[PDB]
Write a protein that binds this ligand. Structure first.
Ligand SMILES: Nc1ncnc2c1ncn2[C@@H]1O[C@H](COP(=O)(O)O)[C@@H](O)[C@H]1O
Ligand SMILES: CC(C)=CCSP(=O)(O)OP(=O)(O)O
Length: 227
């Protein structure tokens, strides 16, 4: 089997790159992401829109309530090995994502050491300013009110109802920022999606800066995959 590994920092265009290869080849893409396995934060966690898949398939390693905690990395790694192992008859698969703890498991795992052909692509963080520009547009996309999917702020207000979701979302990019932003301005979290004209802009810029923080960590902690 051919495994087309696309990894790299947040807001690097990885997902679209993967969808395009998947349109051409017909192969599924397995999301190398733990946080995307909670569909209740589909939007904030980066899941492509159903419209954006262009009819390609995108495979998550689990589907789990947020309050069950984010999928741990060794469990996600067991799962990934299984989604690849039972498709072993197929020409190729696309593995795309930015999970730091999960890429590190793949790099320690003997499973990948043997038995596959590979095309490996590592996307890198650009200049920070260009990064923040892409980040801010991404966040505004995740903030847009559509008919077909809850916004980030809507996902957050829904879950804030459940006290056990609170600690968990405080450890997730975007959400952590949005929560801190609410307390900073004395806003109920319920209120974030009604927020004045130019406070929308502060919050977007604040999240983008949390995304770049994360992308810096990804660049530090990522494995160096051989290619
Ligand atoms: N898709 C995602 N969306 C939001 N935050 C994420 C995402 N993936 C990782 N994180 C953050 O980075 C830490 C996850 O570690 P990892 O999966 O090992 O990169 C999480 O604890 C979140 O704080
Ligand atoms: C880490 C966050 C906020 C979203 C996950 S999707 P990504 O950000 O890994 O994706 P792209 O490189 O934009 O496809």
């Amino acid at each position: 089997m051919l495994l087309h590994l696309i990894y790299g920092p947040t807001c690097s265009g990885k997902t679209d790159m993967a969808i395009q290869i998947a349109q051409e080849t017909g192969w599924p893409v397995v999301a190398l992401d733990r946080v995307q396995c909670c569909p209740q934060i589909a939007t904030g966690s980066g899941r492509p829109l159903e419209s954006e898949l262009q009819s390609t398939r995108r495979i998550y390693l689990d589907s789990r309530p947020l309050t069950e905690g984010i999928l741990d990395a060794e469990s996600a790694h067991r799962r990934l090995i299984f989604e690849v192992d039972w498709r072993k008859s197929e020409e190729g698969l696309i593995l795309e994502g930015g999970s730091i703890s999960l890429l590190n498991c793949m790099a320690k795992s003997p499973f990948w050491r043997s038995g596959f052909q590979w095309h490996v692509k590592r996307l890198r963080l650009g200049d920070s300013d260009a990064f923040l520009t892409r980040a801010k547009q991404r966040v505004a996309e995740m903030f847009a009110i559509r008919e077909d999917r809850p916004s980030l702020l809507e996902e957050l207000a829904e879950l804030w109802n459940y006290p056990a979701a609170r600690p968990i979302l405080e450890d997730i990019d975007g959400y952590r920022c949005a929560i801190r932003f609410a307390r900073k301005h004395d806003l109920a979290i319920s209120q974030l999606p009604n927020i004045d004209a130019g406070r929308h802009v502060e919050l977007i810029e604040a999240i983008a800066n949390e995304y770049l923080e994360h992308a810096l960590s990804q660049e530090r902690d990522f494995p160096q995959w051989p290619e």
